[PDB]
């Protein structure tokens, strides 16, 4: 509790983002662990309730069968508003404690008492922002009572005023705050294709890979050159190369698979769902690779 350590390896799981859509193709008993987006189950802050009462019974059904992870989106963790005022300590911290989650992931953006302004705003890669965000991440982890990992972000422009690269920023951030890392491999792959000079090899060598608690394997698409990270396409092979490469250099605790929103998830997307085996065969491949490097 005074200083958190990386939990033991717990296995592969699915994100459980589609509430009604994924439980129908639920397969066997090999999942064991699933993720829970804390934003979907949180109640408004101008009310007296912490969790949505409809989601209160759903967590009871699953907390017994499967271990359920926490994910902090739209929490305004690394914003400029006071930490006590942010939705992270007011709703996300008790939700992870209510869920009995071993650790909690957290995206690496900006947020000041507002959600949906978080994306497309990576933290300014500067030693000034390193000191500020590490102080917040170290204090926010104290309130969580559990390890706090930071999910790497995919974007189109880095924040103006960047004094270093993303790998150096994340390395200096978790070293000063003592927090951990959540490695989204498709975000790494997206930044390699759409950014001028994103050294994929230097990125892996610069990160403290012994701080990586969880891994994310997803797949997006693009057609003509506009939008990416749709989190829908089949897990591409370059991302699969990073999954096998990461397991040979460090030892995470879990790995989750992200997929699309049930409706849109962007300005123009699709929602048809007849390729359910496309996901089952992805979870099968990533699960077999884990046993190949199993401790």
């Amino acid at each position: 509790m005074p200083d958190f350590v990386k939990p033991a390896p717990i296995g592969v799981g699915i994100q459980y983002n589609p509430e009604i859509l994924d439980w129908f193709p639920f397969e066997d008993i090999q999942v064991d662990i699933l993720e829970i987006l804390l934003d979907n189950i949180m109640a408004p802050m101008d009310g007296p309730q912490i969790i949505k009462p409809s989601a209160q019974a759903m967590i009871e059904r699953l907390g017994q069968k499967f271990t359920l992870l926490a994910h902090s989106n739209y929490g305004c963790d690394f914003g400029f508003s006071a930490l006590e005022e942010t939705a992270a300590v007011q709703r996300h911290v008790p939700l992870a404690k209510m869920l009995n989650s071993p650790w909690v992931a957290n995206h690496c953006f900006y947020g000041d008492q507002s959600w949906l302004d978080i994306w497309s705003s990576p933290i300014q890669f500067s030693a000034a922002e390193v000191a500020r965000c590490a102080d917040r991440a170290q204090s926010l982890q104290t309130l969580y009572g559990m390890p706090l990992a930071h999910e790497n972000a995919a974007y189109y422009l880095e924040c103006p005023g960047a004094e270093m690269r993303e790998a150096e920023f994340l390395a200096r951030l978790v070293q000063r705050s003592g927090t951990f890392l959540h490695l989204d491999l498709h975000n790494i792959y997206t930044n390699h294709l759409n950014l001028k000079g994103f050294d994929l090899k230097d990125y892996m060598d610069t990160l403290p890979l012994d701080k990586v608690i969880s891994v994310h394997l997803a797949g997006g698409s693009w057609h003509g050159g506009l939008y990416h990270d749709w989190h829908d396409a089949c897990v591409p092979e370059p991302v699969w190369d990073l999954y096998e490469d990461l397991l040979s250099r460090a030892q995470p605790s879990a790995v989750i698979l992200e997929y699309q929103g049930q409706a849109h998830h962007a300005q123009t997307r699709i929602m048809d769902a007849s390729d359910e085996s496309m996901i089952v065969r992805d979870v099968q491949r990533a699960q077999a690779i884990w046993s190949r490097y199993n401790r």
Binding site: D46, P48, D112, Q113
Partner: protein, 269 residues
Amino acid sequence: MEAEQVWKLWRRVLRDERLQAQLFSATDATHWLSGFSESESKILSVYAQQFDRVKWFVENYQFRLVNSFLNALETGAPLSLRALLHINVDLNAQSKAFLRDRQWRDYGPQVYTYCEDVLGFLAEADELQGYPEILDLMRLERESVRLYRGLVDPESLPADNRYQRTSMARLYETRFALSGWLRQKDQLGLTRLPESTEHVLIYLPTLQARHKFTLINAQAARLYNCLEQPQSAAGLFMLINSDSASVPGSADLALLDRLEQLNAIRKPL
């Protein structure tokens, strides 16, 4: 270039769509208005290249806020949402209309405050002036929002010698017989309701549960309306608004017993 200054800049751009027309149309250095502060123009000059991504950072902000207009409706007024979807109103045309008046405000986790401003906005829309039954249902839903918001930091009154009205329940005197829609939610906004006033009590079983609707007598509404201020040390039975100076039992005591079970009033313990 402080990180707090590049954020304040985009918060100003996303809320002022007049500034968006200047940045998108004119990509030349001085063609975009130098009315942007000298510190602002330096940050815009970094975005001089890749202005297409800036035009993609907007719209995305607007698409999410237009969808958030529906979440705020599903969170605060799920019945009003189902009635509005049945009569086929362009909520997208109303999301853009509501958000433009608010300068594309990001309500964030203040979903009940969001919903309360939405229900007040839709109560004046010309598309909804022809549906008074839905207009009545929305005001009922607006009291459910005021029920949750009134429990964030309520004035904690200690249990004492007088009948107290709790903050875990509100009352709404309807204009139509809204019970027909509450008892038959498949007819939400579809069927026709009579113009008979009802006394629906929005209350909460527990502080961590979904709020409920229930109907009470006009006598029970008199018992609740006379407890606005806890002037009720047996004076409540004297306070029938000069219509009755009688202190009764069973006829009025059983109603007070049900109101306590519904967490509406606190008996003098």
